[PDB]
Amino acid sequence: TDSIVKASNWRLVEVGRVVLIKKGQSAGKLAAIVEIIDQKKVLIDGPKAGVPRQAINLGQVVLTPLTFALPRGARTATVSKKWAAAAVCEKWAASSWAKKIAQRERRAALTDFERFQVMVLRKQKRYTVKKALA
Amino acid sequence: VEPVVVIDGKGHLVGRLASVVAKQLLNGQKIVVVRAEELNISGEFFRNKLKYHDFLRKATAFNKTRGPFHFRAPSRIFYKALRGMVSHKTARGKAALERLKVFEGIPPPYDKKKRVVVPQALRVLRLKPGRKYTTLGKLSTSVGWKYEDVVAKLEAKRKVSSAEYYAKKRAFTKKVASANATAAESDVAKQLAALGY
Amino acid sequence: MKYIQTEQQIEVPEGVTVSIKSRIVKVVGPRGTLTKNLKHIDVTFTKVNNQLIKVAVHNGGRKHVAALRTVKSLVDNMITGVTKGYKYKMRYVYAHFPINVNIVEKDGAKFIEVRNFLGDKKIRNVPVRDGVTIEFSTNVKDEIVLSGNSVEDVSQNAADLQQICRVRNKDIRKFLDGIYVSHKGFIT
Amino acid sequence: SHRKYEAPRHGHLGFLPRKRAASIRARVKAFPKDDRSKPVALTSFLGYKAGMTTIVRDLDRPGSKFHKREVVEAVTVVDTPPVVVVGVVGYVETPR
Amino acid sequence: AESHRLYVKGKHLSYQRSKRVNNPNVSLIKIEGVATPQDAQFYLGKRIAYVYRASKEVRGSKIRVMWGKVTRTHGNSGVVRATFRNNLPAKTFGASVRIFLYPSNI
Amino acid sequence: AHFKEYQVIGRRLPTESVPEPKLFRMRIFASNEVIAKSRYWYFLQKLHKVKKASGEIVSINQINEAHPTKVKNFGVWVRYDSRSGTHNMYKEIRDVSRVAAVETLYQDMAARHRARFRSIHILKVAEIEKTADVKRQYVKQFLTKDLKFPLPHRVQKSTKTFSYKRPSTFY
RNA sequence: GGCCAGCAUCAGUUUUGGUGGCAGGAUAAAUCCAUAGGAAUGUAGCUUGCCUCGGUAAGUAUUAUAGCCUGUG
RNA sequence: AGAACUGGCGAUGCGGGAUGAACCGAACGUAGAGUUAAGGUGCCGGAAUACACGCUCAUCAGACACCACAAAAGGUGUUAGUUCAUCUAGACAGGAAUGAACUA
RNA sequence: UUUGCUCCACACAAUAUAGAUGGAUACGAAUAAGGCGUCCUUGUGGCGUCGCUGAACCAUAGCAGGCUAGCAACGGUGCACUUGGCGGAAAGGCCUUGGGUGCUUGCUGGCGAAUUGCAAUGUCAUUUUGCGUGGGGAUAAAUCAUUUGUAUACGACUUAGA
Ligand SMILES: [Cl-]
Ligand SMILES: [Cl-]
Ligand SMILES: [Mg+2]
Ligand SMILES: [Mg+2]
Ligand SMILES: [Mg+2]
Ligand SMILES: [Mg+2]
């Protein structure tokens, strides 16, 4: 018998935390936290996505589970080398969160003819799945 | 989008929910509110109890049956807040109020239907943690509502029936998901993935 | 000023097991078990090892931080309650009329009765809360001892016995008659 | 200005309105609280008022001046023939 | 198929108005799925028809139509302004209207 | 508004008796050049016997932040008028530029002391070069090594009136 | 040719988007690049004492197996 | 109650201040379109349950000029600030800060 | 009081719409925490996984949706019946057994459409009632007047009378 205490799994505001911008000119792009200014402001910089080094409000971004090692106050060139070494882009694209964003974009790009093909394929798949149930 | 929208009043601030519902009624949407006894009001219990006493002492001096009517039920308290946000003395206002139903608990006509929530009026999303709030069911009892225990007993019976339905539905969902899982990696499945579905 | 982070430490002895989930705290010890609901503080409990537990507040003000130390004290009292217990001792004080205190059983409710307080004909009855045991100590004149695992249960039960013997319509500086707590300590 | 002298109000405001009763048979609006650990029995009975008369009895009241002494009291007699059970009715609890 | 709809559902909210004065010549229309003035620019110039029923038949039908058009946007939440050949009756506040896809710029 | 920093150089009008009058400079935080020149004469009339009718503006130039992407700890000295009396204060602000620190200062003064723009004089804005020279505890707490903190109770924004699921505040 | 409408090409007034070429400032400031100096919320390395055979703890140490700051070009 | 200068009401509707002869905006033939003033945009009610940094929890909170009231004096409630002293040479309470006097 | 009253099916008229135009798609609780899957010693347990909105899921092709042929499955769904169980808070609904029958776009075919003339809701829903059909079901009361005084200004109330 050992003590049991449930643990929280919050995403921490820290240097090296990868964030996702949801508002502004850089919406939908990834950036890394470089330094914490105050409770609501941090300095971010994403070079790969073309996000300029800027001080941004924490209400403009969403923290992501990804994190990589990064010295405090690192410059744009240093961030780029660390970002590529950690392969942040590859790890992000492998998550279900990113795939859901990619699927949502694909849904809106469909044409009327392609939507007709989706219905035909869905009915064919439905016939097989319903048969397997019975 | 639904012809009838059923709102679960649990965990909703009364004033913010009332403003949302009043606008919906005037736009031509039918609304049904259930579990009105679980509504929340910002502020501690004593403050809201004091406020109702100020409401209780207002009445016509020469005839008490002419003055303001003080309804004690949780559903009618929410109705009072809602009627104040509608021009109820007009034909347009009367027609809007006929599109609304408020109940304590979940009556049989709606216990098998889908219930939604209003995020703008949710207490957990609006009030800062640590702020005091009052439950409408407890407030109504202290001012003369008689049917708190009856509703509580009926709600317990409904939850037992609802739990059995969910257990049966959950088992069926697991079987359906497995059928879809084993139907993947086929030619049809690959084509659907390329198109987003 | 919205302090970034504050922490407190809780020490767990060898024989005590603590289970905390969703601010529901349960402690198990040799003397028994205790439980407490803490869904009114908004704190975070974390476990370091089997011997240390930390409780923290993130971005809290002056009033919120003050309650963090209170939570530590409450859990500590639970832990020492189930490993050492609490013992409150009270003494009977009177000038002329002796005070007769006995244990009675009214419809299976385990009351404690007070007789002849300032020569009153009224019968004073105090309920005994669950988990509190009452014994009249020997080799000491006019002493009653209350013991239990919960400090709040023991302290409140002793407080009820003291409040029930208050003098009315008299100068209480002169009429120093009553039952007062004389020692607070541990069973062990 | 204030009334020159204070007197209690005439009448009781809790018996309003002073209107004719809806039916000649008055309604029983409350029944004794049920005790399920007892045999089934009625809680009320029906009868017809006949009149009043006078009785004499001893008084058993320690401490009273007229203790163990005869007193004269007025009584009312109600004619109560047995009633006939002709049906049952069931009620259910509702939020209304 | 089970559906044959070729229009977008809309609601008649009210007339153009200040706090105490209304203007029956302009009606405010809410379009489902539009919650931004930028989205509402797509529907500018589209024809609007209000369809209602009557007990008396005149030109071989018991159904009558009031025709209109979207003129401009209104506010920040996707509401648009519309004008009809005959002003919509005030009893239709909260009634459904049909926004067609013609004239088409696609 | 969004403040900008200017340098304003002014002089007294040249005269036959006294040619080449001395040049005076000061740094002004203002929304635009029109306000900046107005503020220049406002402070100059508190220090020298001169006014706009007897002076001339020589040059006004915008001053940009040398390192607009570096976090700095600024020490700010201010003088302001309350409802009864005048007081001097010292405050510390952590940001990436002087204009951003000054905008925060005006918001802070209005919020905590109800001081309007007309009642505030900025005596000096300087950057605290060294750590351990910070003397306000609400700034020192952000200078700790390997600072980390979560964001509990996340509240998401909904674009629809009705939701078909109970929201969660996990983060 | 009376009533009510649709489209196209124009004129007057106005509303809302996409996009191109130039000018100015510290001839934007930054980023980036080259070079010199410096420091700590001190990286590697090294010493020291407890340490469930590697993890901290504090001294040294200014780029090394991380980096950052300032000036100049 | 009685004077000075100017603008108003009376002789004047219209938008705003819930409501009001005088305040704010603006003065008026009959219509159409566009843009604004003062004032507003949770619902009544046309228009962001917009964005940003703080402050406040009241067992009689507060909420917008004219305007439909509140004072002296106080609070280890909470926030920021001024001056002085103690503290790395271990203070205060019984291992990092602490004490006192003041300001709003 | 000249074959009336009631229920069922459609036959035609009248009446009206606070406003159908693919589907109101059912756990509870917590939010400084949970959902789902999985394993065990079944717990305030271990492990994995999900969120960051319904932008979903289901449904969705055919004269507003016709007439026919074949293939592969023995599934999917509509209608009328039928077995059983459950639901009283306003239950008037939900689930299930069996066979009959129509459709099936899961796949492959063969004919039909025009002329509403370049758009005109281009009419496909459910509210109530009435008049004619035939297949069943059921054969009363109240009031005035008279009478009573437990009632009463008058009405009303309370009693009696084949
Ligand atoms: Cl009375
Ligand atoms: Cl009579
Ligand atoms: Mg009552
Ligand atoms: Mg006159
Ligand atoms: Mg007013
Ligand atoms: Mg509005």
Short mmCIF file of N, CA and C in Angstrom, two decimals, chain D residues 26-88:
data_model
loop_
_atom_site.label_atom_id
_atom_site.label_comp_id
_atom_site.label_asym_id
_atom_site.label_seq_id
_atom_site.Cartn_x
_atom_site.Cartn_y
_atom_site.Cartn_z
N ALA D 26 -67.93 20.69 5.05
CA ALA D 26 -66.61 21.30 5.11
C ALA D 26 -65.53 20.29 4.74
N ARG D 27 -64.45 20.79 4.16
CA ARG D 27 -63.38 19.95 3.64
C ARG D 27 -62.31 19.71 4.70
N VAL D 28 -61.79 18.49 4.72
CA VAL D 28 -60.64 18.15 5.55
C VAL D 28 -59.39 18.41 4.72
N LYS D 29 -58.65 19.46 5.06
CA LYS D 29 -57.50 19.89 4.28
C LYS D 29 -56.18 19.33 4.78
N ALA D 30 -56.19 18.54 5.86
CA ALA D 30 -54.97 17.95 6.38
C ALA D 30 -55.31 16.66 7.11
N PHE D 31 -54.50 15.64 6.91
CA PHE D 31 -54.64 14.35 7.58
C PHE D 31 -53.43 14.07 8.45
N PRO D 32 -53.58 13.26 9.50
CA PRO D 32 -52.43 12.95 10.36
C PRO D 32 -51.32 12.26 9.58
N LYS D 33 -50.08 12.54 9.98
CA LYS D 33 -48.93 11.96 9.30
C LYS D 33 -48.93 10.44 9.45
N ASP D 34 -48.69 9.75 8.34
CA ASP D 34 -48.82 8.30 8.32
C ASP D 34 -47.68 7.63 9.08
N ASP D 35 -48.02 6.59 9.83
CA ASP D 35 -47.05 5.74 10.51
C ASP D 35 -47.20 4.33 9.93
N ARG D 36 -46.25 3.94 9.08
CA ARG D 36 -46.36 2.67 8.36
C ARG D 36 -46.21 1.46 9.27
N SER D 37 -45.79 1.64 10.52
CA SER D 37 -45.61 0.55 11.46
C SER D 37 -46.85 0.28 12.30
N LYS D 38 -48.03 0.62 11.80
CA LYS D 38 -49.29 0.48 12.52
C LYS D 38 -50.30 -0.24 11.63
N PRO D 39 -51.31 -0.86 12.23
CA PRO D 39 -52.37 -1.47 11.42
C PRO D 39 -53.18 -0.42 10.68
N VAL D 40 -53.76 -0.84 9.55
CA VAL D 40 -54.55 0.07 8.73
C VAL D 40 -55.80 0.49 9.48
N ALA D 41 -56.06 1.80 9.52
CA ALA D 41 -57.23 2.33 10.20
C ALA D 41 -57.61 3.66 9.58
N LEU D 42 -58.87 4.05 9.78
CA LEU D 42 -59.34 5.34 9.31
C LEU D 42 -58.77 6.47 10.15
N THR D 43 -58.75 7.67 9.56
CA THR D 43 -58.28 8.86 10.25
C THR D 43 -59.38 9.87 10.51
N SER D 44 -60.60 9.63 10.04
CA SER D 44 -61.70 10.55 10.23
C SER D 44 -63.01 9.77 10.21
N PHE D 45 -64.09 10.44 10.59
CA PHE D 45 -65.41 9.82 10.61
C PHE D 45 -66.46 10.90 10.36
N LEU D 46 -67.63 10.47 9.92
CA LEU D 46 -68.72 11.36 9.57
C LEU D 46 -69.88 11.18 10.55
N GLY D 47 -70.52 12.29 10.91
CA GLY D 47 -71.64 12.26 11.83
C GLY D 47 -72.51 13.49 11.66
N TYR D 48 -73.62 13.50 12.39
CA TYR D 48 -74.59 14.59 12.35
C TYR D 48 -74.78 15.15 13.75
N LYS D 49 -74.71 16.47 13.87
CA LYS D 49 -74.87 17.12 15.16
C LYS D 49 -76.32 17.03 15.63
N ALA D 50 -76.51 16.62 16.88
CA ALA D 50 -77.83 16.44 17.46
C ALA D 50 -78.20 17.55 18.45
N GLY D 51 -77.30 17.87 19.37
CA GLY D 51 -77.58 18.90 20.35
C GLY D 51 -76.58 18.84 21.48
N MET D 52 -76.87 19.62 22.52
CA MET D 52 -76.00 19.74 23.69
C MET D 52 -76.76 19.34 24.95
N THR D 53 -76.01 18.96 25.97
CA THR D 53 -76.57 18.65 27.28
C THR D 53 -75.50 18.92 28.33
N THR D 54 -75.78 18.51 29.56
CA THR D 54 -74.94 18.80 30.71
C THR D 54 -74.56 17.51 31.42
N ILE D 55 -73.32 17.46 31.92
CA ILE D 55 -72.81 16.31 32.66
C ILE D 55 -72.15 16.79 33.94
N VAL D 56 -71.96 15.86 34.87
CA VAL D 56 -71.27 16.10 36.13
C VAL D 56 -70.20 15.03 36.31
N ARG D 57 -69.00 15.44 36.69
CA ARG D 57 -67.90 14.51 36.88
C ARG D 57 -66.93 15.06 37.91
N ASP D 58 -66.11 14.16 38.46
CA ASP D 58 -65.04 14.56 39.36
C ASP D 58 -63.87 15.13 38.56
N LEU D 59 -63.12 16.02 39.20
CA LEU D 59 -61.95 16.64 38.59
C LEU D 59 -60.69 16.00 39.14
N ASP D 60 -59.86 15.47 38.25
CA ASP D 60 -58.57 14.88 38.60
C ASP D 60 -57.48 15.81 38.08
N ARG D 61 -57.07 16.75 38.93
CA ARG D 61 -56.10 17.77 38.54
C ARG D 61 -55.34 18.20 39.78
N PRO D 62 -54.22 17.54 40.08
CA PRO D 62 -53.45 17.90 41.28
C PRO D 62 -52.97 19.34 41.23
N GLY D 63 -53.03 20.01 42.38
CA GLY D 63 -52.68 21.41 42.48
C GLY D 63 -53.82 22.37 42.24
N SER D 64 -54.93 21.90 41.67
CA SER D 64 -56.07 22.75 41.40
C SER D 64 -56.93 22.92 42.65
N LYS D 65 -57.64 24.04 42.71
CA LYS D 65 -58.54 24.30 43.83
C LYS D 65 -59.68 23.29 43.87
N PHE D 66 -60.22 22.93 42.70
CA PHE D 66 -61.32 21.98 42.59
C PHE D 66 -60.84 20.55 42.38
N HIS D 67 -59.65 20.22 42.86
CA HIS D 67 -59.14 18.86 42.74
C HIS D 67 -59.99 17.90 43.57
N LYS D 68 -60.30 16.75 42.98
CA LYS D 68 -61.12 15.71 43.62
C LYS D 68 -62.51 16.23 43.99
N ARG D 69 -63.04 17.16 43.20
CA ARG D 69 -64.35 17.75 43.45
C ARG D 69 -65.17 17.74 42.17
N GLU D 70 -66.49 17.68 42.34
CA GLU D 70 -67.38 17.59 41.19
C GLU D 70 -67.49 18.92 40.47
N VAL D 71 -67.52 18.86 39.14
CA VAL D 71 -67.69 20.04 38.30
C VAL D 71 -68.81 19.77 37.30
N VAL D 72 -69.39 20.85 36.79
CA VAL D 72 -70.47 20.80 35.81
C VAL D 72 -69.93 21.29 34.48
N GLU D 73 -70.10 20.49 33.43
CA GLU D 73 -69.56 20.79 32.11
C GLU D 73 -70.64 20.62 31.05
N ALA D 74 -70.50 21.38 29.97
CA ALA D 74 -71.37 21.28 28.81
C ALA D 74 -70.71 20.40 27.76
N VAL D 75 -71.52 19.57 27.10
CA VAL D 75 -71.02 18.63 26.10
C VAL D 75 -71.90 18.72 24.85
N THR D 76 -71.37 18.20 23.75
CA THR D 76 -72.07 18.13 22.48
C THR D 76 -72.16 16.68 22.03
N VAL D 77 -73.34 16.29 21.54
CA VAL D 77 -73.61 14.92 21.12
C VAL D 77 -73.69 14.88 19.60
N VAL D 78 -72.95 13.96 19.00
CA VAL D 78 -72.94 13.77 17.55
C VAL D 78 -73.47 12.38 17.25
N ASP D 79 -74.54 12.31 16.46
CA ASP D 79 -75.09 11.03 16.03
C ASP D 79 -74.23 10.45 14.91
N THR D 80 -73.64 9.28 15.15
CA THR D 80 -72.66 8.69 14.23
C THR D 80 -73.04 7.25 13.91
N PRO D 81 -73.96 7.05 12.96
CA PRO D 81 -74.20 5.70 12.44
C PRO D 81 -72.99 5.20 11.67
N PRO D 82 -72.81 3.89 11.55
CA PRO D 82 -71.66 3.36 10.81
C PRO D 82 -71.68 3.79 9.34
N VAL D 83 -70.49 4.01 8.80
CA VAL D 83 -70.33 4.40 7.41
C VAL D 83 -70.02 3.16 6.58
N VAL D 84 -70.27 3.25 5.28
CA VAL D 84 -70.11 2.14 4.35
C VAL D 84 -69.01 2.47 3.36
N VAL D 85 -68.03 1.57 3.24
CA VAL D 85 -66.94 1.74 2.29
C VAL D 85 -67.41 1.32 0.91
N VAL D 86 -67.25 2.20 -0.07
CA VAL D 86 -67.77 1.96 -1.41
C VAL D 86 -66.74 2.22 -2.49
N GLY D 87 -65.48 2.37 -2.11
CA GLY D 87 -64.44 2.56 -3.11
C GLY D 87 -63.14 3.01 -2.49
N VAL D 88 -62.10 3.03 -3.33
CA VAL D 88 -60.77 3.48 -2.96
C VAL D 88 -60.22 4.38 -4.06
#
